[PDB]
């Protein structure tokens, strides 16, 4: 269950998530756009899903893409803030899961975000240990898809 | 015009928004559920739009309602964090406006949130001065609907 995935996050994993978020979450506009644009760069097959955003090749200049990217970072802020109460983490994760289920995004496709997260983390010198911790958080959402 | 509306957020208004948010934003789960449930209590005619959340009279005990309410508070957090840059405030406001336009929510009905905000603020000893500041922020979203 999603609760199981959530309840499994250990103290060490939560520590790594919080420490790295202190940095990557400090510039939501910059890192959010980097995250989304990297997804498009490395997984071009996903571009079609974001037609509402218009020309995503415009990057930062695209106001719809910028608004979407900043907001995505607040979903992550939400997750990080709920780490110590699995009950609250689960209800917010299911909320965002619905946003993706309606767009026909499978658990496997949602996992495509792990590559971009790993790259953004690396840009701030957060290595594999941190990428693995984030993959565990993403897996909580995957349990809901 | 959303831009002209954003221009109404003067130094004094921004300060009142930040000062009051420091308190109401400190308990997103508690104050978010209070805000949403007050909207339902005071404007029963809006409950029909929230069919996805199930039985909203259950308040905090309703997982979907709790997830929705917490997330709503992060949208407000987002707005507050963008107060320094109007172009960014506008792009995030338009993102959330679309979420409501697709739900068929007009500027007038969106404005029904002012009553609940005034009440939640009053419960934390923040009077009309603050309620009016928040009404100006809500007005930016209304301009985009
Ligand atoms: C860290 C992981 C991710 C987070 C936290 C996240 C968060 C969000 C948020 C907050 C929204 C806006 C929901 C709405 O207002 O309707 C959104 C929309 C969307 N997401 Fe994600 N997402 C993630 C990964 C992905 C991935 C990997 C895909 C695709 C393979 C995806 C596809 C979509 C699509 C198609 C939309 C709709 C965009 C639009 O038309 O506005 N998401 N996402
Ligand atoms: C401070 C004001 C408000 C904020 C910041 C806000 C924010 C949000 C957010 C973040 C969502 C989730 C969007 C999504 O994932 O699709 C949402 C959904 C929704 N909002 Fe609001 N909202 C506000 C006021 C209102 C008001 C006053 C109404 C109705 C009169 C309204 C009606 C809706 C509806 C119908 C949904 C869809 C719920 C669902 O089925 O999940 N909102 N709102």
Mutation pick for ligand 2 pocket among B103, B114, B117 (CB with most ligand atoms within 8 Å): B103
One-character DSSP codes across A1-57:
-HHHHHHH--HHHHHHHHHHHHHHTT-HHHHHHHHHHHHHHH-GGGGGGGGGG--GG
The resolution in angstroms reads: 1.6
For residues A137 and A81, what is the distance between their CA atoms, to the nearest angstrom? 12
For residues A38 and B74, what is the distance between their CA atoms, to the nearest angstrom? 25
Chain-centroid distance of CA A143 in Å reads 14
Solved how? X-ray
For chain A, what is the largest distance between any 2 Cα atoms, rounded to a whole number of angstroms? Answer: 41
For residues B69 and B37, what is the distance between their CA atoms, to the nearest angstrom? 9
Contacts of A76 in chain B (CB under 8 A): none
For residues A111 and A137, what is the distance between their CA atoms, to the nearest angstrom? 11
Q: What is the CATH number of the domain that holds B120?
A: 1.10.490.10
Nearest to A60 by CA among B128, B85, B64: B85
Nearest to B69 by CA among B45, B92, B35, B93: B35
For residues A111 and A91, what is the distance between their CA atoms, to the nearest angstrom? 20
Cβ atoms of B78 and B45 closer than 8 Å: no
Residues within a 6 A CB radius of ligand 1: A 46, 49-50, 52, 68, 71-72, 75-76, 96, 99-100, 103, 105, 109-110, 112-113; B 99
For residues B27 and A2, what is the distance between their CA atoms, to the nearest angstrom? 24
Which residue range(s) make up the domain with B76? 1-145
Is residue B52 packed enough to be buried (19+ CB in 10 Å), middle (13-18) or exposed (0-12)? exposed
The torsion of the CA quartet A116, A121, A126, A129, rounded to 10 degrees, works out to: -40
Q: How many domains does chain A have?
A: 1
For residues A28 and A6, what is the distance between their CA atoms, to the nearest angstrom? 24
């Amino acid at each position: 269950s999603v609760y199981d995935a959530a309840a499994q996050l250990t103290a060490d994993v939560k520590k790594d998530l919080r420490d790295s978020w202190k940095v990557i979450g400090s510039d939501k506009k910059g890192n959010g756009v980097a995250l989304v644009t990297t997804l498009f760069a490395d997984n071009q097959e996903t571009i079609g899903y974001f037609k509402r955003l218009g020309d995503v090749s415009q990057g930062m200049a695209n106001d719809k893409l910028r608004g979407h990217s900043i907001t995505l970072m607040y979903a992550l802020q939400n997750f990080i803030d709920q780490l110590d109460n699995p009950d609250d983490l689960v209800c917010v994760v299911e909320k965002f899961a619905v946003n993706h289920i309606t767009r026909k995004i499978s658990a496997a496709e949602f996992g495509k975000i792990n590559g971009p997260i790993k790259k953004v983390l690396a840009s701030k010198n957060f290595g594999d240990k941190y990428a693995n911790a984030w993959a565990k958080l993403v897996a909580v959402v995957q349990a809901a898809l």
